[PDB]
């Protein structure tokens, strides 16, 4: 964000109906800390959530540790407060080049930003995951692979898994159908994604 929100008005952006790829942000070395509670950071690509909220704010190194559940302090007691139970992940990085009297914090005190680590400003983004309030719509990314024809392969098409030979077909699938089944309730053909073609199994 060209400009981050203040801790007295931390931002809460609601993210839904999209694929959230956390591998670029996870591998990115520009972040100072990336602490996830509950789930390991490498399985978020498989897991899915109903909604995610992004709380964005600027704090100071003397309080950068305070973004965690069950913490006390002026910020934890009167400012951005983390809930008692399961939350998502906290991401933070040093922003001394940009934020080190325009920034103040919560009766009101201002940060003594002197650009000369413990007192430096840090930008914190908290990702809160709602996994039950509604049908789930935010899933992690899933990598595609190439399809090999005329060989016994173990395929997985949009969650339908199996083993068989994938070959070209002349079965006219309608635009809205993804896989077709023969008599006896078994798959006869499927429509590939990314390329929209009809493969017989």
């Amino acid at each position, epitope marked *: 964000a*060209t*400009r*981050f*929100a*203040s801790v*007295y*008005a931390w931002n809460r952006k609601r993210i839904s109906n999209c694929v959230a790829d956390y591998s670029v942000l996870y591998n990115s070395a520009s972040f100072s800390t990336f602490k996830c509670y509950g789930v390991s950071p490498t399985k978020l690509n498989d897991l899915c959530f109903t909604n995610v909220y992004a709380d964005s704010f600027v704090i100071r190194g003397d309080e950068v540790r305070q973004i965690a559940p069950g913490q006390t302090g002026k910020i934890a007691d009167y400012n951005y407060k983390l809930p008692d139970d399961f939350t998502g992940c906290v991401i933070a990085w040093n922003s001394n080049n*940009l934020d080190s*009297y*325009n920034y*103040l914090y*919560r*009766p*009101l*005190q*201002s940060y003594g930003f002197q650009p000369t680590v413990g007192y430096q400003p840090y930008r914190v983004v908290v990702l809160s995951f709602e996994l039950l309030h509604a049908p789930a719509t935010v899933c992690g990314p899933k990598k595609s692979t190439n399809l090999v024809k005329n060989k016994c392969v173990n395929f997985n098409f949009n969650g339908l898994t199996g083993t068989g030979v994938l070959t070209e077909s002349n079965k006219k699938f309608l635009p809205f159908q993804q896989f077709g089944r023969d008599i006896a309730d078994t798959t006869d053909a499927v429509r590939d994604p990314q390329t929209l073609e009809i493969l017989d199994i």
Partner: antibody
Amino acid sequence: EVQLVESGGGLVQPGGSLRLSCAASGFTFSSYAMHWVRQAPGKGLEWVSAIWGSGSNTYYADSVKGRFTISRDNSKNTLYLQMNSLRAEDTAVYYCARGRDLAAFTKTAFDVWGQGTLVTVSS
Amino acid sequence: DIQMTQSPSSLSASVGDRVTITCQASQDISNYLNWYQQKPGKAPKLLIYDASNLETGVPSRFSGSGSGTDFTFTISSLQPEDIATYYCQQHDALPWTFGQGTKVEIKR
């Protein structure tokens, strides 16, 4: 509706003192940061002072550092500006402006800008 | 302090013309700059804050741009009530300084 009705301006001899008032109504005065900005006759804008809610976090422009004192009020919600040791260069129309420096990093600007009060330093 | 060499000092344009007023900076002030419209005898009125976000209650014909140390600022359609003097104010390091100001008048 936000309303910054200004008063307390008038005629002062050089070297005298004067107290300015900037009343507020229609919003939470105690939760906002309040500023003073002046403009010399026919010249550009020049910032004066600022009080960010607390009675200790006061900041002044270099041209008025040490001479001008800013203060506020709870209850009735009004703003004051103590002006001391005036010279001929201090003649300007004084405005009290707003400020939401507390949360908003978007409305960093002066949302309203009162109508201003005239102070003339002359004998 | 931070100095702004806002140029030109004055420019002439006609009704409907596009107006650009440059406002420099000192040290990478990003988007902590505000714009003000002032009419004779009237208090300044916000025009562009954070170099891109238009204020509420302002007609959409007013627009701002720029970031860092250069700020472009763009007027789309001149209206006869838009005659005023415009000021750019740096708002990063303890906002103190204003701009010298440019007088925008209708070419005739």
